[PDB]
């Protein structure tokens, strides 16, 4: 399908499926993330350290899903990572800063779902800096 179609569908889903709602959006993104990871070169991550898995998501997964790589990746080397997209696609004024969280839920599941397929358990949340800059926080418990 054409790239724009996903955004159109996603925009309608957030409107219609409008914190249990976020849970639903995140849950859907989780099943899609699982299937997507499944089709990426998962094998190459065999014998790799956690760090490479997260780079995989920033590059391999983000390109496949948004036709671009993550703009930056940070870590505290204690299981927590912050992925930053300087111009997140699904975010099509200060009045919308509070609404932005709704448009990031599905992608959090996408990331969480992809990690699951790679054998990793995690919790993903997101926040917005100065629109359209978005930060996805991946926390791998340990």
């Amino acid at each position: 399908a054409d790239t724009v179609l996903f955004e159109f569908l996603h925009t309608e889903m957030v409107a219609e499926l409008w914190k249990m709602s976020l849970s639903v959006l995140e849950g859907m993104g989780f099943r899609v993330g699982q299937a997507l990871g499944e089709r990426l070169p998962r094998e190459t991550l065999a014998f790799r350290e956690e760090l490479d898995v997260l780079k995989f998501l920033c590059k391999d997964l983000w390109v496949a899903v948004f036709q671009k790589q993550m703009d930056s990746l940070r870590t505290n080397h204690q299981g927590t990572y912050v992925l930053q997209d300087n111009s997140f696609p699904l975010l099509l004024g200060l009045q919308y800063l509070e609404e932005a969280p709704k448009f990031l839920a599905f992608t959090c599941g996408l990331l969480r779902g992809a990690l699951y397929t790679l054998g990793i358990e995690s919790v993903v949340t997101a926040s917005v800096a100065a629109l359209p800059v978005c930060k996805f926080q991946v926390v791998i418990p340990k």
Binding site: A1, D2, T3, V4, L5, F6, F8, L9, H10, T11, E12, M13, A15, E16, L17, V24, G27, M28, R31, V32, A35, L36, R39, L40, A64, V65
Partner: protein, 161 residues
């Protein structure tokens, strides 16, 4: 890996089916959502093709089938079963455009899996002053030899004013 739309649409149908006990309610929701996407898609389409305004329902069919579908789904549905008056035609597809497989046993016999498309078609055309009815009259996911979407010209929508 552009199977993102298919996977995402699949999850939406699954989620709506859990949120609504009745399938008719899902079809209704899928159609409204499709309508809303259709109003936006038409702008995007005209901006990327510059095909111009059609004049007959016959011209609309060629644009929808040979240009719109090719641009958004990479496919070219066939045009058949024209009404003598030319106010109705059918789009023939090899299979369901939005869904590849359905869960078994069948718990959603009345559910129109890709009802979103019909809403998209109606919404996009409404933006060009054409009140039309898009409807699946045949579906491979339903056991039919082909997937068929019937397009019916209802009336010309008056200008905004």
């Amino acid at each position: 890996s552009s199977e993102l739309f298919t996977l995402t649409y699949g999850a939406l149908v699954t989620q709506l089916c859990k949120d609504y006990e009745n399938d008719e309610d899902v079809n209704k929701q899928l159609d409204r959502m499709g309508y809303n996407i259709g109003v936006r898609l038409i702008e995007d389409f005209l901006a990327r093709s510059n095909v111009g305004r059609c004049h007959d329902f016959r011209e609309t069919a060629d644009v929808i089938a040979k240009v719109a579908f090719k641009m958004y789904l990479g496919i070219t549905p066939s045009i058949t079963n024209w009404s003598p008056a030319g106010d109705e035609f059918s789009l023939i597809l090899e299979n369901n455009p939005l869904v590849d497989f359905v869960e078994l046993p069948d718990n959603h016999s009345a559910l129109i899996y890709s009802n979103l498309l019909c809403g998209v078609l109606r919404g996009a055309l409404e933006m060009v002053q054409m009140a039309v009815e898009a409807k699946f009259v045949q579906d491979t996911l339903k056991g039919d030899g082909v997937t068929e979407i019937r397009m019916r010209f209802i009336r010309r929508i008056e200008d905004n004013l």
